[PDB]
C-alpha cells in the first residue's frame, strides 16, 4: 500500500493509495489539500501520488516548499538512500519515493498536481 | 534578461538526422518546463514536443512520437531536439520556448532556427 | 482532442475596434487556459495574452482578452488599432498531452 494521494478517477488500478479524491468533481480554481504526516522511529514506507494530469514540480525528486522556490529532496530529508519509482496509466502518472531508516530532522514539502484549470496539492511531514 | 539561444540546424539530405540545441540564459534552468514549436511555410504554428523541470515529464504529438527525441542537459542548461530521420515535410522554422506550466502558456521564446529538407 | 479553428484573415481600419475569435472543437472552451499569441513576420512570437484575459507586462492595455460561452469561443479585442499590429496572431489551448494551436489569423491593417 502506498502511504499517498491519488487524483485520479480510473477505478481500475494495480496501484492501491491510503487517500483518494478525485479532482474531475471540484470547482474550477478549488484547491484540494491532502497531508501526510509520518511519525515512527523507523521508516520503510512507500509514499507517492497518482496525478491524472501534470505534475509541478518533478515531484520527490525536486519538491516545492512549505511563487516558492523548488528544493531537491535528497538534501532536504538529507539522507542519501531514497529510491525513486514512476509508473504511466493512460493519462494517470504515478510517482513515488521509498525511504528507509531515520531522518536528522522534521522536515515537510509539498507538491502540486494540475489538471485543467482545477490544481490540488499535497504536502508530507516527516518528524525526526 | 532571459535568452533562449538556438542553434544547430539548416540544409540537409532526407533521411539524415540532425539535433537542434537551444542554450537557456536568463532563468533557473531545472525550474521551468521547456518545449519546441514549429512553423511550416504556410502551415502555422504546430508543438511538436515538450520537456519537464528535469525530464521527469515528456510529450510528443502521435505524429512525430518515436522519430523525434527532446532531451534535456543541467550541466550545459541545454534543450536538445534530436530529429532523426528528417522528411520532406520537416523543412520549417524551430523555436524553443520557456513555458510556465501552472497559466499554460509559453512564457519566453527562442530565436529562431531554420531546417531545411531537400534532395 | 480538440481543435481550435481561426479565420483565415481580417481587415480593420486604423483607430477603430477588432475583434478576433477563437472556437473550440470538442469540450468547453472555459475549462481549459486560452492563451494568444503575436507573430511577426520574420521574427519570433511574443505573448500577447497569457491566462484568459490576463495580459503580461510590457502589452499595452489596448489588447484585451474574453471568453465567449454563448458561442464557445476565446474573443481577442483590440481597440484603437495602429499600424504596428498588422501580424499573425494564434490561439492555443492545452489539455493534458497536447498543445493545440489555432489555424492563425492574419491581421491587415488597412491605412
Known amino acids: 500500500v502506498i502511504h499517498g494521494c491519488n487524483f485520479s478517477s480510473n477505478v481500475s488500478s494495480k496501484h492501491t493509495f491510503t487517500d483518494s479524491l478525485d479532482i474531475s468533481l471540484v470547482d474550477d480554481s478549488a484547491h484540494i489539500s491532502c497531508n501526510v504526516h509520518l511519525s515512527e522511529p523507523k521508516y520503510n514506507h512507500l509514499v507517492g501520488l497518482n496525478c491524472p494530469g501534470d505534475i509541478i514540480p518533478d515531484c520527490f525528486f525536486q519538491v516545492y516548499q512549505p511563487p516558492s522556490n523548488i528544493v531537491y529532496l535528497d538534501s532536504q530529508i538529507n539522507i542519501g538512500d531514497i529510491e525513486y519509482y514512476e509508473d504511466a496509466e493512460g493519462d494517470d502518472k504515478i510517482k513515488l519515493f521509498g525511504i528507509v531508516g531515520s531522518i536528522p530532522k522534521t522536515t515537510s514539502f509539498t507538491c502540486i498536481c494540475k489538471k485543467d484549470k482545477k490544481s490540488a496539492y499535497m504536502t508530507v511531514t516527516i518528524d525526526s | 534578461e532571459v535568452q533562449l539561444v538556438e542553434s544547430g540546424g539548416g540544409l540537409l539530405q532526407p533521411g539524415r538526422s540532425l539535433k537542434l540545441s537551444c542554450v537557456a540564459s536568463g532563468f533557473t534552468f531545472n525550474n521551468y518546463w521547456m518545449s519546441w514549436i514549429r512553423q511550416a511555410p504556410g502551415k502555422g504554428l504546430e508543438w511538436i514536443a515538450s520537456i519537464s523541470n528535469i525530464g521527469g515529464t515528456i510529450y510528443y504529438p502521435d505524429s512525430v512520437k518515436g522519430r523525434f527525441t527532446i532531451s534535456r542537459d543541467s550541466a550545459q542548461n541545454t534543450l536538445y531536439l534530436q530529429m532523426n530521420s528528417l522528411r520532406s515535410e520537416d523543412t520549417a522554422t524551430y523555436y524553443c520556448?520557456?513555458?510556465?506550466?501552472?497559466?499554460?502558456?509559453?512564457?519566453?521564446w527562442g530565436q529562431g532556427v531554420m531546417v531545411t529538407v531537400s534532395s | 482532442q480538440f481543435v481550435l479553428s481561426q479565420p483565415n484573415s481580417v481587415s480593420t481600419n486604423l483607430g477603430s475596434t477588432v475583434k478576433l475569435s477563437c472556437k473550440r472543437s470538442?469540450?468547453?472552451?472555459?475549462?481549459?487556459?486560452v492563451s494568444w499569441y503575436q507573430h511577426h513576420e520574420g521574427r519570433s512570437p511574443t505573448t500577447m495574452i497569457y491566462?484568459?484575459?490576463?495580459?503580461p507586462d510590457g502589452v499595452p492595455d489596448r489588447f484585451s482578452g474574453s471568453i465567449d460561452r454563448s458561442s464557445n469561443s476565446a474573443l481577442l479585442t483590440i481597440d484603437n488599432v495602429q499600424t504596428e499590429d498588422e501580424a499573425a496572431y494564434f490561439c492555443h489551448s492545452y489539455s493534458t498531452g497536447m498543445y493545440i494551436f489555432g489555424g492563425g489569423t492574419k491581421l491587415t491593417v488597412l491605412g
Open positions: 491566462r484568459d484575459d490576463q495580459r
Open positions: 470538442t469540450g468547453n472552451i472555459g475549462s481549459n487556459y
Open positions: 520556448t520557456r513555458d510556465l506550466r501552472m497559466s499554460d502558456y509559453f512564457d519566453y
